[model samples]
Target: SMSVKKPKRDDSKDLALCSMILTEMETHEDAWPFLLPVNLKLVPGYKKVIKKPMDFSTIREKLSSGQYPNLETFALDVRLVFDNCETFNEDDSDIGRAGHNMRKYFEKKWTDTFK
Candidate 1:
């Protein structure tokens, strides 16, 4: 739950979309503990405020307060995850084995998320 604030501009919606994509990438592998530990909470209000369609200033304010730890750390963690997953590319037309594996893994295990 590394709640990232949007940049100050008219890109609040874009930022929100990107944030959601990145959040799913991180959590797709059961990374909540690594992203936000129980002892270090997620600074709360992540899924309610910053996640909504808000202005850049409001998003920035929410994330910049740093009340929550591992905001930036989780970003880097996601980047690493993407990078690692990128290496399993097999063929141009195959859609990569890593991506397929990730998809199947989540497809079977992520029923709880829908619930």
Candidate 2:
């Protein structure tokens, strides 16, 4: 596989904060739906719908792998998870509500941790 140039920014702070965020989110009560990738075999339409799939486990692996090199890049995937949930579910649905709640929680944590 071809490799792309990685950013050379210094983000030791981001690495630590993002790791902490992942830990908190993984333990969130609303985290059930996002603990792992959605079962594609069970929900075949998921493959057709959400173009980019994200989950706590996936994020954890990426963060552990050093793919999350900065806060911006890390936030992108977390935001995507919520956005995809909103797109796939009804606003009043449990998973949908969780996405909104998680978004709020993530934003607050991001702000409080960094600012």
Candidate 3:
């Protein structure tokens, strides 16, 4: 069963960010796994974080618990997840392009929403 927690930034920005990522994932289904995995496992007390794909429910839990304080940090963490999966910063691949575009969009949207 999946768990859900109240989002920390349940404001427009938070909803927008969540929708943005999920929408991008839907649009780029092929690369979605590379960005956010459906199935993932973690080792006890592991030094490296995000060793697996993150589900939306888990993300909500983390967000509600303040694992991500704001859109900027959350977006960076998302990119980091992609980096851990070796799917970021590649202009050649579709996944890379989508990830990059999504990140940029989130950043811009956050700014627009907040500012």
Candidate 4:
């Protein structure tokens, strides 16, 4: 597995942007079309990693059959977000500011997905 590198701006701005995206989804129903929810902690504490669209299809099937409510769906959404995110070209930067962008994801958010 590879690792994430951090820069000084890694903390606040990244956190803000991620929060913006989340808030947008929660407040605007239409935004759900673009939302990707997941526990970044599952990937790693150091970097941002995402799964591809095809990889997400498996999750969708399980979710739709009522195997789970939104858990698979959200995870897949999160996967797409990370998978499509632009990686840093600098040997020092990361796709997620070294998890700074994913901090809020680790916090518990209310949903019926996992239960």
Candidate that would win on TM-score: 2
lDDT of 3 by residue, 29-71 (tens): 4545443343424433323444554433455556667787666
Q: Tens digit of lDDT per residue, candidate 4, span 8-114?
A: 43233433333343454345433232344343565452244333432233333443455533334444454454344333223245534423344234233323212
Which of 2 and 3 is ahead in TM-score?
Answer: 2
Off by over 4 Å in 4: 1-21, 24-69, 86-91, 98-100, 103-107, 110-115
- After TM-score superposition, the amount by which residue 53's alpha carbon in candidate 4 deviates from its true location, in angstroms, is 7.2
- Evaluate all candidate structures by whole-model CA lDDT and list the values in order: 0.39, 0.88, 0.54, 0.38
Residue 93 in candidate 3, Cα distance off native in Å: 1.1
User: If ranked by lDDT, best first, what sequence of candidates would result?
Assistant: 2, 3, 1, 4
Residue 28's lDDT in candidate 1: 55
Q: Taking the tens digit of each residue's C-alpha lDDT, what string does model 1 give over 57-88?
A: 33234444543243444234333432333443
Compare candidates 1 and 2 on lDDT and give the better one: 2
Model 3: residue 101 alpha-carbon error in angstroms: 1.4
| Candidate 3 pairs with clashing backbones | none
Give lDDT: candidate 4, residue 72.
40
Residue 65 in model 2: lDDT: 92
In candidate 1, clashing pairs total 0
Global Cα RMSD, each model: 15.9, 5.4, 9.9, 16.2
Against the true structure, what is each candidate's TM-score?
Answer: 0.25, 0.87, 0.45, 0.26
